[PDB]
Design a protein around this ligand. Structure first.
Ligand code: GTP
Lengths: 55, 190, 101, 134, 148, 67, 27
RNA sequence: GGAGGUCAACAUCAAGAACUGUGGGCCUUUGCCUAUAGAACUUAUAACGAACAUGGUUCUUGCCUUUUACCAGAAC
C-alpha cells in the first residue's frame, strides 16, 4: 500500500504542475522537466515512484 | 463441495438439494461432520448445469464452491490383534488384494451367462454353486470357496477360522450383526 | 425465465390427426410402442424429432418465419431456457403422437 | 506435372478402397496415401548444391521404353591414337550505463533481476555483465 | 422498381459478387472458431471482471469485493493444487470454476467440428472429387426400366 | 483430478478443430504414486506437488477438509 | 490473461495496469 | 383494369410463447368451460435495424480551486 500511495502522490504533484499551466499532454512535458536538478533549472523532484510493483 | 454464503440461508439450501436429488438422477448429495455439502456428478458440464439451476431456478441463495476435486478410494497391496472398548470381545481381520481379473468382473454386475464370471450378487442362489463358479474360473481356494461369506458395495468377505468350526451355532446368531458392522465400516475408511 | 412453455389450452397447436382418435388406440396394448432416441452429440436426435411433430401438427405458434423456411432449426424438445442458451440437450423430453406406417 | 500425378493417385487410390491386396503391401500403400495429406515434408531435403540457373538445365527427356545404346564398350581399355581499429571504449561504455541504470532503478533485487533477464543479453556479454554488478 | 427496395438475383451473378468481394468479406466460417470470442463470453468477462487474452477490459460491475468472511472453508490447508484454473475456464463454465457469479450469461458450449472442404486454385477441377486431405477409406426386369 | 479444464485447452490450442468427451464406464481405478503414510516427502505450498509423493498430499488434505 | 493478478481495473490507478510475469522468480 | 411512385394519410409492431372473431354452456355482459373460423409483419446463440448514436435523473467511481466541458460502470 505504501508503494501504491507513492505512485499516486508523485503523479498528483506532476499533475499539479501540468494543471498549473494548462495541459496534460505528454509531449510538452518530457521527464527532463520534472527530474532535472534545480542547478540546471528544473524542479529537481526526486522520483521513487517508477519502479515496478510486485502484484 | 458447497456451503451457503450467508449461513442463515442453510434451511433454504436443503430444500433445493432435495429437489436436485430428484431431477438429476446421477447426482449424489452428501453431508459431512464438517457441515459442508458434497455434490457429485459425471463431469464438468454436468456440474455446471446443476449450479445454474441451483443458484437461479431452485434456491435463490448464493453459495461458495470448492475447487474441482475428485473422489478417492482405498485398497491394499502385499499378525493381528483387535479389541473391544469393554474388552469382552477381541476380533482379528486380515486383508488381502483381489486379483485384477476378479474386480474386473465385479465392476460389471452380471448374471453369469456362458464363460463369463458370475457376479457375487447371486449369493441367494446356491453358495456351493458359487464355490464351483469361483474355483472354475480363477483357480479360487477350495476351502475358502464354501467360506466366502457375504458381499458389499464393493469387494467380498471370507470366514476362515476355528471358531466358525467351534461355534457355528452361536456365530450364526451374530453374523447378521457382523455384516451390519461391515457396511458401517467400509462406507468409510481408515 | 425457466422455460418456454404453452400454458393456455386454446393455444395448444391443433393436431390434424384428431387427438381423440389417438386416445382410442391407448387401450389396445399391442397398438402402442414406446421408443426413445439415443446417440452421440449433435447427431440430429432433437432435430429428428422436430420432423415428426411439424408433420403431425397443423400450426405451431413457436414457428418463426425463419425456422419454418429453413435457416434455423426449430427445436421442440429443447424446452428449457438453459438448453436453448447452452445449445444442447440437458433433460429428456418426449412427445406422444400417432403416425402411420 | 500435378494432373498426371493426380491421375496416378486416383488409380492408386482405386486399388486400395475397392480391391483386395496383401496386408503388408496394402499398409505401405495406405501410408503413401496418408503422406499426400501430409505433403511429403520428410521427403524434400537434400543436396541441391547447384543454383537453378547454374545447373545448365539439360533436362534429358528419356522414355522408359526407348532402346537406348548403353555404351558398355567405352568402359573397355583401347588404344587412342588421338577498416578502423577502435581504441575507444564507447561501444562498451554504452553497455555499462544500460546495466547500471537498470540496476539503480528497481527497488529490491528480484525486480532488477527481472530487467536483466528481460534484455536477453548474449552469452558473450553475460560474462562481463557480472563484472559490472560486482 | 424505381423506389429501389427488395432486390432479387440469379445464381451466377451472386457467384460473381462473392468472387469480387473476397478482399473484404473474406472471413472464418465455423461457429466453432469463434468459441470464447462470441458476445456471451465478452458479457461474462465484463460481469466477472476477467479478460480473455485478446478481449476487452471494462470496469468491475461489482467493484466491491472488499467485504470478507474469514473462514476455514477455502483454506490452503484444505485445497488440492493440481491445476492452474486459467481464466478461460472461468469464462468457459462460469457457474463452476467461478463463485458468486452475478449477471452471467450461459456460454453456448459446442459445435460439430466442421470438415468443410473446397479447393480454391483450379476452377476447372470438378465439384465432386476425393480431396487429398481425406483419409483413404435368376430373374430380370423389362428393358427401358432405368433410374428415375 | 487432472481433467479440470482439460477440454478447453484442447479446443483453444487447436483453434476450434478438435473436441473431447470424458466418460467414466470402465471404472478403472489406479494407484496414486506416493506412499499414503509418509510424514516427510512433501515439498512446499501453492505449486502442484511433485509426483514423487502425491498420496500423502491427497490424504493430508481430504483429512483436513473432513476432520 | 487475468489469472487473479493485476488490478480490478486501472482507473484509480495512476498506472497503466500492465502486468508482466517475472522472469527472476520461477524455480 | 394492370404495372409502378426515394408520393400522402390512417391503423398496428416486445406479450401467461405472448392474436382476434364466432356458436353453445355456467354465471346474470365482465369472468369461467366448450366447439369452431381466420392469424400479414417482428422474434430463440431471442427481435421492428445482420446497424448503433446522444441526453436526463439517481447511485458508485476517476481527474480535483469552483461551474461548464469531462473519466466509466450500474439502475431507471
Ligand atoms: N450440416 C448439417 N448439420 C445438421 C444436420 N442435422 C443437424 N445438424 C446440426 O447439428 C446440430 C444437431 O442438432 P440437434 O438436434 O440439436 O443435436 P442433438 O441430436 O439434439 O444433440 P443433443 O445435444 O445430444 O440432443 C444442430 O446444431 C443442427 O444445426 C444436417 O443434416 N446437416
Amino acid at each position: 500500500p505504501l508503494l501504491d500511495i507513492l505512485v499516486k502522490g508523485e503523479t498528483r504533484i506532476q499533475n499539479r504542475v501540468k494543471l498549473g499551466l494548462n495541459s496534460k499532454m505528454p509531449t510538452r512535458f518530457p521527464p527532463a522537466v520534472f527530474y532535472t536538478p534545480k542547478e540546471l533549472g528544473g524542479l529537481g523532484m526526486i522520483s521513487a515512484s517508477h519502479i515496478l510493483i510486485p502484484a | 463441495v458447497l456451503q451457503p454464503l450467508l449461513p442463515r440461508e442453510l434451511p433454504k439450501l436443503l430444500d433445493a438439494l432435495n429437489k436436485i436429488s430428484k431431477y438429476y438422477p446421477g447426482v449424489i448429495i452428501k453431508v459431512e461432520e464438517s457441515g459442508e455439502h458434497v455434490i457429485l456428478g459425471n463431469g464438468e458440464l454436468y456440474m455446471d448445469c446443476l449450479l445454474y439451476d441451483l443458484r437461479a431456478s431452485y434456491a435463490k441463495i448464493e453459495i461458495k464452491i470448492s475447487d474441482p476435486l475428485t473422489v478417492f478410494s482405498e485398497s491394499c497391496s502385499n499378525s493381528r490383534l483387535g479389541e473391544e472398548n469393554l474388552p469382552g470381545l477381541s476380533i482379528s481381520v486380515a486383508a488381502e488384494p483381489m486379483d485384477s481379473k476378479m474386480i474386473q468382473d465385479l465392476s460389471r454386475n452380471t448374471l453369469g451367462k456362458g464363460q463369463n464370471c458370475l457376479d457375487i450378487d447371486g449369493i441367494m442362489d446356491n453358495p456351493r454353486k458359487l464355490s464351483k463358479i469361483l474355483r472354475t474360473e480363477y483357480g479360487w481356494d477350495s476351502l475358502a470357496s464354501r467360506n466366502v461369506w457375504s458381499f458389499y458395495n464393493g469387494n467380498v468377505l471370507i470366514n476362515d477360522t476355528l471358531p466358525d468350526e467351534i461355534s457355528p451355532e452361536l456365530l450364526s446368531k451374530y453374523k447378521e450383526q457382523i455384516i451390519q458392522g461391515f457396511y458401517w465400516a467400509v462406507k468409510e475408511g481408515p | 425465465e425457466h422455460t418456454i412453455f404453452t400454458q393456455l389450452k386454446k393455444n395448444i397447436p391443433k393436431t390434424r390427426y384428431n387427438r381423440d382418435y389417438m386416445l382410442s388406440m391407448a387401450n389396445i396394448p399391442e397398438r402402442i410402442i414406446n421408443v426413445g432416441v439415443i446417440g452421440p452429440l449433435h447427431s440430429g436426435k432433437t432435430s429428428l424429432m422436430d420432423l415428426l411433430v411439424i408433420d403431425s401438427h397443423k400450426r405451431i405458434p413457436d414457428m418463426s418465419k425463419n425456422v419454418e423456411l429453413g435457416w434455423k432449426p426449430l427445436r421442440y424438445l429443447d424446452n428449457l431456457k438453459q438448453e436453448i442458451d447452452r445449445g444442447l440437450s440437458i433433460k429428456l423430453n418426449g412427445s406422444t403422437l400417432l403416425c402411420t406406417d | 506435372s500435378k494432373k498426371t500425378h493426380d491421375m496416378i493417385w486416383e488409380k492408386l487410390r482405386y486399388i486400395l478402397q475397392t480391391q483386395e491386396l496383401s496386408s503388408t503391401l496394402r499398409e505401405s500403400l495406405e501410408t503413401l496415401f496418408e503422406i499426400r495429406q501430409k505433403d511429403y515434408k520428410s521427403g524434400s531435403q537434400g543436396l541441391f548444391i547447384l543454383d537453378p540457373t547454374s545447373y545448365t538445365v539439360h533436362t534429358h527427356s528419356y522414355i522408359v521404353s526407348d532402346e537406348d545404346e548403353a555404351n558398355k564398350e567405352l568402359g573397355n581399355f583401347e588404344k587412342c591414337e588421338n577498416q578502423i581499429y577502435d581504441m575507444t571504449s564507447t561501444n562498451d561504455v554504452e553497455f555499462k550505463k544500460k546495466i547500471y541504470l537498470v540496476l539503480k532503478s528497481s527497488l529490491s533485487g528480484d525486480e532488477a533481476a527481472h530487467k536483466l533477464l528481460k534484455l536477453k543479453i548474449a552469452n558473450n556479454l553475460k560474462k562481463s555483465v557480472v563484472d559490472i554488478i560486482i | 422498381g424505381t423506389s429501389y427496395k427488395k432486390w432479387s438475383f440469379d445464381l451466377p451473378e451472386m457467384s460473381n459478387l462473392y468472387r469480387l468481394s473476397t478482399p473484404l468479406r473474406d472471413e472464418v466460417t465455423d461457429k466453432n472458431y469463434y468459441y470464447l470470442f462470441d458476445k456471451k463470453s465478452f458479457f461474462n468477462g465484463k460481469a466477472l471482471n476477467n479478460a480473455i487474452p485478446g478481449g476487452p477490459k471494462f470496469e468491475p460491475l461489482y467493484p466491491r469485493e472488499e467485504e470478507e468472511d474469514y473462514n476455514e472453508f477455502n483454506s490452503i490447508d484444505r485445497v488440492i493444487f493440481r491445476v492452474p484454473i486459467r481464466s478461460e475456464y472461468k469464462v468457459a463454465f462460469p457457474h463452476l470454476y467461478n463463485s458468486r457469479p452475478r449477471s452471467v450469461r450461459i456460454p453456448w458450449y459446442n459445435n460439430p467440428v466442421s470438415c468443410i472442404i473446397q479447393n480454391d486454385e483450379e476452377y476447372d477441377t470438378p465439384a465432386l472429387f476425393f480431396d487429398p486431405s481425406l483419409n483413404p477409406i435368376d430373374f430380370t426386369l423389362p428393358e427401358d426400366f432405368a433410374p428415375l | 483430478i487432472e481433467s479440470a479444464g482439460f477440454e478447453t485447452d484442447l479446443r483453444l490450442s487447436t483453434n476450434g478443430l478438435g473436441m473431447c468427451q470424458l466418460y467414466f464406464w470402465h471404472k478403472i481405478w489406479r494407484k496414486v504414486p506416493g506412499d499414503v503414510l509418509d510424514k516427510d516427502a512433501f515439498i512446499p505450498k501453492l505449486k502442484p506437488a511433485p509426483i514423487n509423493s502425491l498420496s500423502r498430499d491427497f490424504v493430508m488434505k481430504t483429512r483436513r477438509r473432513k476432520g | 490473461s487475468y489469472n487473479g493478478i493485476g488490478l480490478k481495473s486501472a482507473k484509480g490507478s495512476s498506472t497503466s495496469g500492465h502486468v508482466q510475469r517475472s522472469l527472476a522468480s520461477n524455480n
